[PDB]
Amino acid sequence: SSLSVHSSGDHVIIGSYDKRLCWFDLDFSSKPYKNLRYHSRALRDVSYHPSLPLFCSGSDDGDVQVFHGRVYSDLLANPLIVPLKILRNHKVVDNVGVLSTCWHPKEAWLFSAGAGGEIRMWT
């Protein structure tokens, strides 16, 4: 469905219609480094914070998954990908939920757009 790139340039997130999030590390392997299936419905968009090591996945289930993705340049340390929050209480209209998610350029603020015209500010 959608992809985002870490500012370091060596990490990619793949948001898929298969309700899956694939973390690709360009020096790790051609296969996805991690595959995550927390979303219960089709995943629409994935966004990485340009500066902070935080990223989010917005799907049609109405839930936004906020994960902390930590990256070191050291080879011995694989990037640490951990869930941090499960944003809920967003309505789903015509089988369309959280369609787009955006990150604040500086701080950990989330711009989530729904199918009902609601823009939620997750601070």
Partner: peptide, 25 residues
């Protein structure tokens, strides 16, 4: 917040379909 995080902290490494055994029983 910690118990909820541990609930979705199930990103593999738990072998193949093993922890649900104990959780269900």
């Amino acid at each position: 917040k910690e118990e909820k995080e541990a609930k979705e902290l199930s990103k593999m490494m738990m072998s193949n379909k093993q922890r649900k055994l104990y959780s269900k029983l």
